[PDB]
Amino acid sequence: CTRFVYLDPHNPDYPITARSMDWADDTETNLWIFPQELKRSGGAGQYSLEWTSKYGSVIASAFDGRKGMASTTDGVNEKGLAANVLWLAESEYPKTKPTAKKPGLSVAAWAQYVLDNFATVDEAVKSLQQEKFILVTKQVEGQKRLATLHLSLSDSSGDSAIIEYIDGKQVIHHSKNYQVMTNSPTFDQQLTLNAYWDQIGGNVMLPGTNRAADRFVRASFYVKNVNPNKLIPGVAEKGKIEKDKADLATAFSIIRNASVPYGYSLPDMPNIASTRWRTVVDHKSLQYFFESAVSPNIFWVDLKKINFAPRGGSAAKLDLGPNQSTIYSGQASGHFKPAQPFEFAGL
Amino acid sequence: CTRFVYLDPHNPDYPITARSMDWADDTETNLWIFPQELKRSGGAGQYSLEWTSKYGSVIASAFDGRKGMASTTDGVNEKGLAANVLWLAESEYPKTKPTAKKPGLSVAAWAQYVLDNFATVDEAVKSLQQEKFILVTKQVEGQKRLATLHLSLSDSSGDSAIIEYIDGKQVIHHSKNYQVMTNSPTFDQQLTLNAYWDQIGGNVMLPGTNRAADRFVRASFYVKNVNPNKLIPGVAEKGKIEKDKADLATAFSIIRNASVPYGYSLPDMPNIASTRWRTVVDHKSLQYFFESAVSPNIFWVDLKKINFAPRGGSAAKLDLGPNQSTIYSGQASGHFKPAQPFEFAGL
């Protein structure tokens, strides 16, 4: 997976987050509207963390019809906080067992928890630093193992953060400068990957392979060097709306450039996989775009057009069908249908 | 600017052509249905070539509302012949002036002529070899005086050809092996660009810039090494339809990978420009897909659902609006509206 936040110097206060989901198999992803005040359980042990959602969200699920595997993978809430769970990471989660004072939170609900409770990256980082819970993952049927993952976050202010578990310890990097994040290697290592390429130009050469390092490097270069709203001699400066749209096109093109062609696989490197879909978050407009790479399907969801007030514990679901082939076009909030929140995987 | 034909070894007799259009400005592109038996003139000048179309086509136009610079840039006809006019080429067209038999054909109509008259690449190559006409251009004053292109072709049989004008002479390369074609450098040079990268693995390294050479190399690699219909015994072997769809997804992902991010420009290399849109041709199903890179818009046109019988010299047009922002979804033949064929640029 690849994620970035794109910031146009010529169109400030208009951040756009984009992400690719990379996995070798169908993720059976659908979209969900989750209203305010849902009562949720962490899905861990007898000491599972508990909360009541404060903010409504639109999210992208994976395997939501399977008790064993259902998760929130990606989403944005009504305050503009976006969260992405990047798969095929190299995390080692805590050994320590959940206790009533420090209860468990399933990995499957990790992003949901954040989207449900916090309005900004900063807010979320402050709360996560207190280590109020233990992140847990399951023991599962063989062949193969599963997914390790880490969590990236972004704001309407353009802020960014990433949270990983290395040697069982929670490691947080928080800065508006952390515009690009890949699933691998660890973020400390990610931070040094550009240096060589900055020394020579990115216009001179870039690595082109699918490797996480290459995707990171490519995306870092384009995000810093592409301005679609440059002033041109003889051509009116564009209006705000046109500038916004151009930024959106730029973000889409970069995340497409960092995607992994469909069907590609390398036995030596099992952490490289087909990009199956992409999401793009326009924070200011609160618009959540979804794009299938498997089926022709691109559309968005306008959180301003959704009522996130409580619905007596029910929610809504946009069924994308097999291989995300069920076509929706334009603003799609109207096509969401009532449904009970799926259960998060855990124990 | 990038085109390829994708052939899946595990799903034979199902070729897919894909192309990216790269240009620094809005091309004001729309789609057009052109029925059988349109009477057409080569656009230049006293001695313009004349013909009556034998096959109907769906095509993508550029600047079709401007006398000076309307053209057919891309399309497929009812027999599965696809044609693409690749822009920012390094062609030098003939010096020789048009004479009544050998009359002139404007560059703007070059692809249309081929789509109108021939059913296969082979048929088209045989006719083009006879040099029945002189290709002409050169009508505007312009900000700076240069523009150029070459013509790539493909079949339902998976056959390929490219036609260029080098030192004023027509050069044709015709072979099912010519799966990938870029706008630059000349095709003779293109043919040698992979060798180095074949020697080392493409899984080992690929060049990752927007240079035509890099795009050619990346696309060549993915086209030969990606099989989305590999048996994985594990997951049921797929049905014909699912294999077809997977091939479609693969082709889309590869052309996206070879696209140029929107807003990117390099003063030293003016022949690199933003990808503005992509088309994909499914020859067997006769489906023509169009995808904007500027606006969210992806849909297709099913030639089996169109009646290509003569309409007393009229045609139909699918208006894509400013920046191709007018949204259509699914099979869009029904949204085409009657209109008179635009005039091809020339003299």
**CA–CA dist B77, A56 (Å, integer):** 49
Using the 8-state DSSP alphabet, how is residue A129 labeled? H
**CA–CA dist B108, B115 (Å, integer):** 13
Could you tell me the sign of the dihedral formed by the alpha carbons of A90, A95, A101, A106, in that order? positive
For A259, the token pair is 């995607």
For B214, the token pair is 């890099």
**CA–CA dist B210, B265 (Å, integer):** 9
In the beta sheet, which residues pair with residue A19?
A: A3, A279
**CA–CA dist B262, B293 (Å, integer):** 8
Cβ count within 10 A of residue B237: 12
**CA–CA dist A230, A8 (Å, integer):** 10
Minimum distance, in Å, between the CA of residue A149 and any CA atom of chain B:
24
Cβ count within 10 A of residue A19: 29
Nearest CA in chain B to A300: B296
Please name the residues in contact with A157: beta carbons below 8 A apart, sequence gap of 6 or more: A15, A120, A121, A176
Q: Which of B228, B263, B329 lies closest to A329 in CB terms?
A: B329
Most A-contacting residue of B257, B272, B295, B327 (CB-CB within 10 A), to test interface: B257
Number of separate domains in chain B: 1
Burial of B143 (0-12, 13-18, 19+ CB in 10 A): exposed
Please name the residues in contact with B305: beta carbons below 8 A apart, sequence gap of 6 or more: B331, B333
Q: Residues B65, B317: contact at Cβ < 8 Å?
A: no
For B253, the token pair is 């992902």
Geometric angle at alpha carbon A271, from A23 and A325, rounded to 5°: 10
**CA–CA dist A43, A52 (Å, integer):** 14
Please name the residues in contact with A276: beta carbons below 8 A apart, sequence gap of 6 or more: A21, A22, A23, A26, A27, A29, A262, A292, A293, A294, A324
Technique of determination = X-ray
Using the 8-state DSSP alphabet, how is residue A322 labeled? G
Geometric angle at alpha carbon A165, from A162 and A169, rounded to 5°: 120
Cβ count within 10 A of residue A262: 24
Asked if B262's CB is within 8 angstroms of A250's CB, the reply is yes
Contacts of B256 in chain A (CB under 8 A): 256-257, 259
Q: Residues B107, B98: contact at Cβ < 8 Å?
A: no
**CA–CA dist A214, A143 (Å, integer):** 29
* Cα B186 from chain centre: 17
Q: DSSP 3-state assignment of B187?
A: helix
**CA–CA dist B88, B274 (Å, integer):** 12
Nearest to A226 by CA among B264, B293, B294, B22: B264
For B74, the token pair is 């891309």
Please name the residues in contact with B272: beta carbons below 8 A apart, sequence gap of 6 or more: B22, B210, B211, B212, B260, B264, B265, B266
For B133, the token pair is 């006409």
Q: Residues A62, A29: contact at Cβ < 8 Å?
A: yes
Largest CA distance in chain A: 68
- Characterize the bridge pairing of strands B134-136 and B104-106: parallel
Could you tell me the sign of the dihedral formed by the alpha carbons of B17, B18, B24, B28, in that order? positive
**CA–CA dist B170, B58 (Å, integer):** 26
Cite the DSSP H helix spans in chain B: 110-117, 121-129, 187-190, 195-199, 212-225, 240-257
**CA–CA dist B115, B122 (Å, integer):** 13
In the beta sheet, which residues pair with residue B99?
A: B102
Please name the residues in contact with B222: beta carbons below 8 A apart, sequence gap of 6 or more: A261, A264, B202, B254, B257
Cβ count within 10 A of residue B66: 12
Q: Which of B207, B248, B296 lies closest to A208 in CB terms?
A: B207
Cβ count within 10 A of residue A3: 27
> Is A25 marked active-site?
no
Nearest to B261 by CA among A256, A163, A17, A304: A256
Domain that holds residue B3: 1-347
End-to-end alpha-carbon separation of chain B, Å? Answer: 26
Do you know the residue count of chain B?
347
Burial of A234 (0-12, 13-18, 19+ CB in 10 A): exposed
**CA–CA dist A294, B252 (Å, integer):** 9
This structure's resolution (Å) is: 2.5
Nearest to A293 by CA among B315, B250, B227: B250
Do you know the residue count of chain A?
347
Burial B239-256 (b: 16+ CB within 10 A, else e): eeebbbbbbbbbbbbbbb
For A38, the token pair is 């849902």
Could you tell me the sign of the dihedral formed by the alpha carbons of B181, B185, B188, B192, in that order? negative
**CA–CA dist A147, A89 (Å, integer):** 7
Q: What is the CATH number of the domain that holds A192?
A: 3.60.60.10
Omega before B45 cis (within 30°)? Answer: yes
For A123, the token pair is 């807010």
Cite the DSSP H helix spans in B11-56: none
**CA–CA dist A146, A151 (Å, integer):** 16
Look-up of token digits 């490519």: A218
**CA–CA dist B243, A71 (Å, integer):** 28
Does any CB of chain A come closer than 8 Å to the CB of residue B200? no
**CA–CA dist B178, B175 (Å, integer):** 6
Q: Residues B283, B249: contact at Cβ < 8 Å?
A: no
Q: How many CA atoms lie within 13 A of A201 on its CB side?
A: 5
Minimum distance, in Å, between the CA of residue B255 and any CA atom of chain A:
9
Q: Residues A302, A49: contact at Cβ < 8 Å?
A: no
**CA–CA dist A2, A22 (Å, integer):** 8
Asked if A275's CB is within 8 angstroms of B289's CB, the reply is no
Packed helices B240-257 and A240-257: angle between N→C axes, nearest 10 degrees: 110
Look-up of token digits 């009812």: B78
Which DSSP string do the residues of B119-175 spell out, in sequence order?
A: SSHHHHHHHHHTT-SEEE------SSS---EEEEEE-TT--EEEEEEETTEEEEEE-
Phi then psi for residue A282, to 5 deg, are -95, 100
In the beta sheet, which residues pair with residue A4?
A: A18, A180
Q: DSSP 3-state assignment of A89?
A: coil
Cβ count within 10 A of residue B120: 18
**CA–CA dist A217, A182 (Å, integer):** 10
**CA–CA dist B274, B262 (Å, integer):** 5
- Characterize the bridge pairing of strands B149-154 and B82-87: antiparallel
- Characterize the bridge pairing of strands A134-136 and A104-106: parallel
Cβ count within 10 A of residue A95: 8
Nearest to B226 by CA among B211, B206, B196, B209: B206
Q: Residues B115, B77: contact at Cβ < 8 Å?
A: yes
Could you tell me the sign of the dihedral formed by the alpha carbons of A111, A115, A116, A117, in that order? positive
Q: Residues A115, A81: contact at Cβ < 8 Å?
A: yes
In the beta sheet, which residues pair with residue A308?
A: none
**CA–CA dist B117, B56 (Å, integer):** 9
Q: What is the 3-class SS of B225-262, one letter each residue?
A: HCCCCCCCCCCCCCCHHHHHHHHHHHHHHHHHHCCCCC
**CA–CA dist A131, A114 (Å, integer):** 13
Please name the residues in contact with A231: beta carbons below 8 A apart, sequence gap of 6 or more: A10, A237
**CA–CA dist A220, A197 (Å, integer):** 10
Report which secondary-structure segment, H or E, holds A224.
helix A212-225
Most A-contacting residue of B8, B23, B203, B280 (CB-CB within 10 A), to test interface: B203
Contacts of B295 in chain A (CB under 8 A): 245, 249
For B154, the token pair is 């493909």
Q: Which of residues 223-252 of A touch B (CB under 8 A)?
A: 225-230, 245-246, 249-250, 252
Q: DSSP 3-state assignment of A50?
A: strand
Contacts of A217 in chain B (CB under 8 A): 208
For B283, the token pair is 């020859």
In the beta sheet, which residues pair with residue A299?
A: A290
The residue type of B62 is A
Q: DSSP 3-state assignment of B330?
A: coil
Q: Which of B249, B293, B299 lies closest to A262 in CB terms?
A: B249
Minimum distance, in Å, between the CA of residue A174 and any CA atom of chain B:
28
**CA–CA dist A78, A16 (Å, integer):** 15
Geometric angle at alpha carbon B143, from B190 and B105, rounded to 5°: 60
Q: Which of A260, A294, A298 lies closest to B298 in CB terms?
A: A298
**CA–CA dist B88, B23 (Å, integer):** 8
